[PDB]
Amino acid sequence: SASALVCLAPGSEETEAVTTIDLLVRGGIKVTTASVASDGNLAITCSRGVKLLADAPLVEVADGEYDVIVLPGGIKGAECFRDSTLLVETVKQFHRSGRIVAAICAAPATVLVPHDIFPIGNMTGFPTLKDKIPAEQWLDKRVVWDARVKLLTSQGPGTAIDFGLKIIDLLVGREKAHEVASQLVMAAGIYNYYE
Amino acid sequence: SASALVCLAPGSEETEAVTTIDLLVRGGIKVTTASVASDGNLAITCSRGVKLLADAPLVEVADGEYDVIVLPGGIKGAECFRDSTLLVETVKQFHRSGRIVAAICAAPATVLVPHDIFPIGNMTGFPTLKDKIPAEQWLDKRVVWDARVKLLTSQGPGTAIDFGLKIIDLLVGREKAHEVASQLVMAAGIYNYYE
What we know:
9 strands, homodimer, 7 helices, two-stranded antiparallel sheet, alpha/beta, 33% helix, globular, 7-stranded mixed beta sheet
């Protein structure tokens, strides 16, 4: 019954987007993928050339009942998100209606900071873009959850599993996050939610 | 100047396939994705519902000049590979011609073992299918590289980074594998090709 809206744009980082979708589905979360900044076109070419077909254009699903909106990274994809008025207003509406905003890699510095969507929360993002995140908000951690503003952020392609597991934890509970983690053959170092 | 053929089928594990493609492209390797769908369809629905567009049907690219053939997992996609005469003949020709076969998760047990393509050689795969790999060949390692038979295997969605990095090491070398590893924000328990 939990559901997630995953946004995709030309140039989105395909490992970040796809790993997240896969884990959410494994956790029993219903995923809808939406194309952004493509004028309705569902075929999206990602940052390293992987071509994905989205379920719908964002304009058709932005008003749906979702529990979380996910913004993948990739520099060019995040620039498309930043420059889409519909995307920015949808993110603002998710936050004001008490839902979770989840963003990884380039998306925090490129989308959230320029639009002053989260003037107070803690956030992380891709390390070489650290200087784009106000110093008092930056944390250098694989995943950052700020419950005050319901903002989940993470750093890069190699933290996509950490990112997806924390969404599962927040929406359907720690037991399910551990169940999914136990299917993956995760690296040592990544939290598996057993404790 | 290295190149890779990545095979896709209905039910392929999308995190394994996409993470591998992404890392190979970051490493400067040319990637062609080939559909093994029996009717030649290029719009592949993966195991958790992600829709990927392959570049070409396998019959149009199987005789290409590729250094490695990559078989992603996912139990239903691997069954498709197993039951495709062209796929199996192509894997055999890659091996007989001195090239690398790389397989992850369900693909070793489902594709390579029933067809007796590697009667000698160490291999791993998804741990719940360990009993389908002859005991004298099984190792429980994240990645297994047997240079005697040029067989690269790996275990699951969570070892896809380890898998793609080793393909880079073999095709382009340790220096490029470290360069790519350094971009990812990888977890501690994945080898990073630095000493």
